Amino acid sequence: MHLETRLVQLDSAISMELWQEAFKAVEDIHGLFSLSKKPPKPQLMANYYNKVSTVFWKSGNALFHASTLHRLYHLSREMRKNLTQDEMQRMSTRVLLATLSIPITPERTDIARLLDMDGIIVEKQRRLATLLGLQAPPTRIGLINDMVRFNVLQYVVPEVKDLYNWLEVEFNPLKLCERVTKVLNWVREQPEKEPELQQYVPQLQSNTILRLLQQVAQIYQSIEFSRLTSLVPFVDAFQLERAIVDAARHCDLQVRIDHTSRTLSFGSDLNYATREDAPIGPHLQSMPSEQIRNQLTAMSSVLAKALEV
């Protein structure tokens, strides 16, 4: 008579497009729930967690959405034992949920409020995480493998099984352009595959570019982008060109942006500080080709010496 009093407060608010008082409601359901470890925590909580999912899916980053979906994956498979669902279509639905939600955001754009004390809400992320059940705020794709630790790798449906076997596993310069978005256009099949599966695709396309430009940036170091528009045949030509520079300006890699003759080199290395690996965590599997900088002098000289001594 209280969680269901607040869960009608929640559905009504989110259906009314009221995200401020919807957040206040997802706080209230847990402000009440904080004094609800006293009950053996119920296993009809999938309701609460799939609603705060729907609440985050467009408001908060897919980061916090994916972290919520992991806590669903834990809880609502503890259900699939107790609840006991004979559902392979839901197994496909909930693995693609947890996957599609993960590879969305490489970096958050917090410099609009770095003017006047930024770190505040960057730290409040931990208070948001308190409502999820987390203490340490969520990681990136590092997460996806923290449940490929589980049988995600087997249970996931062969529509998308062999898509991350590109993205995370098979790192290529030019063998992903016509290998992700092709079978993502095969994902776009509209009606029966839960239109929930769709709205991950605009960030999927963005994220695929944000991966594979850091690839060809540290794989090649000078391609001409009269050819590169053909190299990656995405739906865009213009918005992809200003997505090349969008990645560069928003600190993914190093390129020569807007050349008149349109020769866009990547260089060696000239500005290696933090906008190489975007920022510290690399978007590059076993490519990372030789850049040179500080202290490498002493410790490479004595490392290489003493490997055989």
Residue with tokens 């009950």: 39
Q: How far is the CB of 260 from other proteins (least distance, A)?
A: 5
Among 1, 37, 89, 120, binds other proteins (CB under 8 A): 120
Task: Locate 85 and state its tokens.
Answer: 């669902």
Strand partners, 233: none
d(CA 231, CA 223): 10
Residue among 112, 169, 235, 280 that touches other proteins (CB under 8 A) = 112
Question: What 8-state DSSP symbol labels residue 166?
Answer: I
H or E segment and range at residue 264: strand 263-265
Q: Token pair 């006991």 is at which residue?
A: 84
Q: Which positions ≥6 away from 175 have C-beta within 8 Å?
A: 166
Q: Is 199 in the site for other proteins (CB under 8 A)?
A: no
Contact 287, 253 (CB under 8 A): no
Residue 19 in the binding site for other proteins (CB under 8 A): yes
Q: Does 246 engage in binding with other proteins (CB under 8 A)? A: yes
Backbone angles phi, psi at 137, to 5 degrees: -55, 155
Interruptions in the chain after residues (C–N over 2.5 Å): none
- Rounded Cα–Cα distance for residues 236 and 208 (Å): 13
CB of 33 to other proteins, least distance (A): 17
Instruction: Give 229 or 265: the residue with its C-beta nearer to other proteins.
Output: 265
205 binds other proteins (CB under 8 A): no
In the block, tokens 């729907």 appear at: 54
Interaction between residue 136 and other proteins (CB under 8 A): no
Tell me which stretch binds other proteins (CB under 8 A): 3-11, 69-77, 121-129, 148-156: 121-129
Which part of the chain contacts other proteins (CB under 8 A), choosing from 30-38, 81-89, 179-187, 284-292? 284-292
Among 162, 258, 279, 281, which residue sits at the site for other proteins (rule: CB under 8 A)? 258
User: How remote is the C-alpha of 275 from its chain's centroid?
Assistant: 19
Binding window for other proteins (CB under 8 A); candidates: 30-38, 141-149, 159-167, 256-264: 256-264
Please report whether residue 305 would count as binding other proteins according to CB under 8 A.
Answer: yes
Residues that bind other proteins (CB under 8 A): 17-20, 22-23, 58-60, 109, 112-113, 115-116, 120-121, 124, 127-128, 173-174, 219-223, 238, 242, 245-246, 248-250, 254-262, 265-269, 271, 273, 286-287, 289-292, 296-298, 300-309
